[PDB]
């Protein structure tokens, strides 16, 4: 449905993965020798576009972005 893109400016705050209500994000180890970790977006079907992660990321401009796209039952948050 949506597309959550994670850019190079991450620093491993782990704030995005916590703020996500639907657990769309995950912190994975980066192949960078001195880079501790980096975020990920493995289960993007469950994104609900609430943009909490964009509010959490403390970079000058956000390392993470949520681009709106094709909607569905899960993305629109319809229990019915």
């Amino acid at each position: 449905s949506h597309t959550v893109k994670i850019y190079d400016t991450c620093i491993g705050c782990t704030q995005c993965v916590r703020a996500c209500p639907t657990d769309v994000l995950e912190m994975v180890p980066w192949d960078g020798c001195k880079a501790a970790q980096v975020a990920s977006s493995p289960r993007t079907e469950d994104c609900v576009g609430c943009k909490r992660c964009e509010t959490a990321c403390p970079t000058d401009f956000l390392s993470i972005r949520v681009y709106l796209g094709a909607e569905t039952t899960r993305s629109m948050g319809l229990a019915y």
């Binding site: 994670i6 190079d8 970790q37 980096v38 993007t44 956000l62 229990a79």
Partner: protein
């Protein structure tokens, strides 16, 4: 899925016709003490002494409930996805470690090595099926 349902009289807010037809969810957790906890949708309920189970409409309700369980110091919250055919999948944690703590088995996905400002202009990728963020 094995567990005792929390004791509550019932509520208008809860499972709907979507549950039978489309992907009802279920959350599982084990409690040390029987305590009163607010339900995800209206009201209060009493969790049992061990192996509680609750059927849930959306995945958001389960994780929202898990944050409340952490106030009671219950961190073993498990969520499943129940299709109409009965297929149950260990959905929320794919591996035993939580999403916050790093694990070697995971792999980065949808990672853009460029900076956000280095994205191309949309005029460069018009009439191609490509998107700027990709």
């Amino acid at each position: 899925l094995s567990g005792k349902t929390p004791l509550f009289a019932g509520s208008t807010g809860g499972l709907l016709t979507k549950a039978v037809e489309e992907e009802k969810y279920a959350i599982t957790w084990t409690s040390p003490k029987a305590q009163v906890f607010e339900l995800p949708t209206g009201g209060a309920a009493t969790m049992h002494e061990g192996e509680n189970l609750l059927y849930i409409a959306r995945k958001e309700y389960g994780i929202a409930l898990g944050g409340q369980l952490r106030k009671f110091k219950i961190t073993n919250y498990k969520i499943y996805r129940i299709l109409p055919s009965g297929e149950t999948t260990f959905i929320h944690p794919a591996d035993g470690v939580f999403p916050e703590k790093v694990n070697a088995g995971r792999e980065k996905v949808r990672f853009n090595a460029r900076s956000i400002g280095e994205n191309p202009n949309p005029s460069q990728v018009k009439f191609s099926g490509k998107a700027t963020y990709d």
